């Protein structure tokens, strides 16, 4: 279905649904909180996502966001995620499972409902992923299907970052571009059919965890969906 | 092979080759020429490339640029592409083969070695294409892989639009993001392989054709390739 937003910032956080941890800070989404020290807090999950819902059959879409990582430490954790997931779907574990996962079935694809784009800054030996920090996609399971490292000088940068998302719904095909000013650029492409895993509605938003000595913010965002009829 | 280029606007030109009718104009590329009036001079094709060739094997890439298309009626032709092709190609006919054809073998995969992401002004039915102006991607043919309407409202806007094309050396996948400010977003993607169609060198660069009415001018462009090892 055809559904289109826009946020050059959020100064206004209306049509943005927040669980967990999320909140609004200082026109950005903060997706996980800090304490009265501006210490993030640990062991702590949140979402923002978009409150419509919209259809994927038969439909394309092109989403863009900046964000900041600001890190306090050589060891953040864990990073965050864009998302689409059921218009139900609650804020999930914390830590390494980036709200997106429970532990007992993070890595069964039969289990899960979820596609997401993923940050990733803290190695996990819990399951699979590599041995650096990555950006991936998820499909289905917190162990990513296709992943590509993250440059530290990137992670580190305090740089506002910028994501492009786009699936093309007639090649059934998932991209992610990431850039950083005078920084990295990051490809991850693959072949999924999001109309077959949902075909109902869903919601696309954020999802991010801690972890330790890391905040995630959205500076903007912005969202359109067409139809391939 | 890694190679890395910014140009936040063509007050240089340093590493770009120049061939046919593009020349620096502007603090722009212009694709093709126009007379001592400024009017659009037809059937002519150009191309602007960057002057350093690089290899495709194991390799992804990123690149972005922007760019303005002036019509001067409502019956503008013909449109332009970003390509790869091998280092000595060079420009080929004017027209609707946007100078990246041969009227002989236009249709001919296995006679043309060039894959583009094409923004095409003008409907021909001299071969297979859509009878709406129209994004596509090519490859090894005029008659475009994957293809989807351009919007009559974002191709005389005079805007400065958006272009982003990747390629994910793994799952061997090229996908454009056009986007207008403003106005419409476009997602295309297509399964090539590209290291399979140039096993050698290659060189990335702009090719505009007329036509009649209207010239293709690019702002800025960067670049860079990183290998998948
Ligand atoms: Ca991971
Ligand atoms: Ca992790
Ligand atoms: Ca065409
Ligand atoms: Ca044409």
Redesign the interface.
Known sequence: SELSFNYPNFQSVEDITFQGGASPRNETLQLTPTDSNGIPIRQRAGHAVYSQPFQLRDT???T?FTFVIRTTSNSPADGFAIFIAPPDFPVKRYGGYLGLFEPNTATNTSANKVVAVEFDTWVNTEWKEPRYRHIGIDVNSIVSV?VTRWQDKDVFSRSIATA?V???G??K?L?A?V?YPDG????????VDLAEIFPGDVRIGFSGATGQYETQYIHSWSF?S?STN
């Open positions: 394309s879409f092109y863009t296709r492009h786009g699936y093309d007639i090649s095909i991209t571009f850039t990295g650029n990051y490809v991850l492409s693959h072949v359109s067409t």
